[PDB]
Ligand binder design. Sequence first.
Ligand SMILES: N[C@@H](Cc1ccc(O)c([N+](=O)[O-])c1)C(=O)O
Ligand SMILES: N[C@@H](Cc1ccc(O)c([N+](=O)[O-])c1)C(=O)O
Ligand SMILES: N[C@@H](Cc1ccc(O)c([N+](=O)[O-])c1)C(=O)O
Ligand SMILES: N[C@@H](Cc1ccc(O)c([N+](=O)[O-])c1)C(=O)O
Ligand code: NA
Ligand code: NA
Lengths: 309, 309
Amino acid sequence: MDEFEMIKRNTSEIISEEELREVLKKDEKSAHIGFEPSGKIHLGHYLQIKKMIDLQNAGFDIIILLADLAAYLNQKGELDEIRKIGDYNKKVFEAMGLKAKYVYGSEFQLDKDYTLNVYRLALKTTLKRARRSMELIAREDENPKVAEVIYPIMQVNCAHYRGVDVAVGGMEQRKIHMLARELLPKKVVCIHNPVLTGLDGEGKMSSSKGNFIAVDDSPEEIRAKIKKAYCPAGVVEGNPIMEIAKYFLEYPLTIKRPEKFGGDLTVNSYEELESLFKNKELHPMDLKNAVAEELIKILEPIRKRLLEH
Amino acid sequence: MDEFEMIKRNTSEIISEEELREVLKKDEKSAHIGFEPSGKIHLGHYLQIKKMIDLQNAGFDIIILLADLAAYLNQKGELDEIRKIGDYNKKVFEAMGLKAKYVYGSEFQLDKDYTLNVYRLALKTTLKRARRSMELIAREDENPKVAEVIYPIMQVNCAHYRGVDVAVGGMEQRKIHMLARELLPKKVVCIHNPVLTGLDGEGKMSSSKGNFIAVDDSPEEIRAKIKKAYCPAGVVEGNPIMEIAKYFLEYPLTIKRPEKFGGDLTVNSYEELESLFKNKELHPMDLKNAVAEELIKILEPIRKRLLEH
Ligand SMILES: N[C@@H](Cc1ccc(O)c([N+](=O)[O-])c1)C(=O)O
Ligand SMILES: N[C@@H](Cc1ccc(O)c([N+](=O)[O-])c1)C(=O)O
Ligand SMILES: N[C@@H](Cc1ccc(O)c([N+](=O)[O-])c1)C(=O)O
Ligand SMILES: N[C@@H](Cc1ccc(O)c([N+](=O)[O-])c1)C(=O)O
Ligand code: NA
Ligand code: NA
């Protein structure tokens, strides 16, 4: 498995693979991702940091944008407070093993030249396109604000300004990224990670929807959250427990079961697990028990690093 | 006629008169108006500069904003070119006798603190409200751009930033001004001048609609434009020729007519003229002849100052 395939693994899309293959030849290459600071850092965050670690192992310099000004425009509070939560998020990412450079958006996003470019992009971006780009990002608002349409052109300008080769984010970012690839002279390679389903199966996992596992959740909390989670027998689509098994667990995987239910079961790949589960040969409760215990072990070093502060 | 009434004369509205009366007591008081730079300076501009001269005579320090960055956001071209047209407009205003300070918007509107405040106002302003505020300003665009909704919050921030006591503009600005009075801690007094009708009577006089008299138009050009203008007998509403008589001409006014049509006629006020014209006692052609010749004399010193450059 070469560098390209390592980077591609468990992504939803790469825009475009040919452009990524051209970047991979350079000696010096940079990848960045931005996060609105979040009170809790959850598995959706972790999936993305894992992808940044993969890029780092492929020779990329990693930059983590603590997107304080974007969060401000998206109604997350005052800059002062947002920045404090950003510093906490930095500590969590560091505890995940990421070695990276961290920058706050407002360190450069209020520069005269940055702003001037935002206004030039504003002349090229329709209101309809900007609003469409924000459908999966913008905070719920019955009376959408002008800030909502500044946000995307701010993010477009960010990759242009910083000179990054690769931008990474969840699929919720893909319309902003395709706007950037249309408007900017240098085309940035975009790597989009899948959006995890919330534990109740009803929407996407989100810090604001209370449907997440946080990386520093206690073992008991993780067991309770998974016990209650949506997980229909034979159903993989939209099944948060199967997503966790696909994106976080190490294989071959031994699923412990009582002898009266088949005894311990060893699966060599996620695809094998998927066949077992689809064939109703693996019961949700045993899948849940394995996913909970393996996820606890995966998160343990992160939780422990945060606990010793 | 005191300072308040001099300022009020020929305005459409003052928001509010009580606030203006409080400003008038101060020793130091400032009034400003902004103009997107315009290739031609027309009677609509002149009406407003006349109002700035009235404020100047009432003890106000006058600032003329050459609104280069606003014009840029409203699709009037590149900043470089817009700024050149701004310097020409300054020369025209000076030729009208205005003594004032001139500032380009971009001298301060790209400051970090200015921008930060724009983004704070963006959080408080709905997209619907911003678009409504721009209905009579925004350049025609079948696909409205994000720039269109940045523009008004930029203008709101301008009066707040510069610390002006009074903002002056045409009635087309009134929704932006009422947004500013809602969002800003210090309430700015707003003085709105009437919108002149275009010469063909079909819309408002505009530099982009080719329906204007420019202050530096030749006498022959002024005569031809007025000869062709909408001017129905007995109709005052929407009659550009009667508007010119109301807002630019000095009274008492002697209207020369052939003896076979009544001979020379002297009117002591615009209201007298209005009664004559409504009663079909003054024919459009004689009104036009008088308005053309008196307007030529009014504009003559401006045209001559510009010609001797
Ligand atoms: N849109 C990202 C945050 C973000 C990512 C990348 C960026 O460049 C910026 N930005 O520029 O402000 C912001 C999120 O949903 O969390
Ligand atoms: N359509 C989603 C977009 C969204 C998802 C998750 C979120 O955390 C936020 N948000 O609050 O910024 C917004 C919503 O209902 O809001
Ligand atoms: N809206 C004005 C121009 C303008 C007036 C006042 C202002 O403060 C600003 N501005 O801030 O950019 C711009 C026009 O239609 O010509
Ligand atoms: N509703 C008017 C608003 C407007 C009037 C005059 C103008 O010069 C401009 N303009 O081009 O900026 C715009 C229009 O049809 O455009
Ligand atoms: Na090398
Ligand atoms: Na005094």
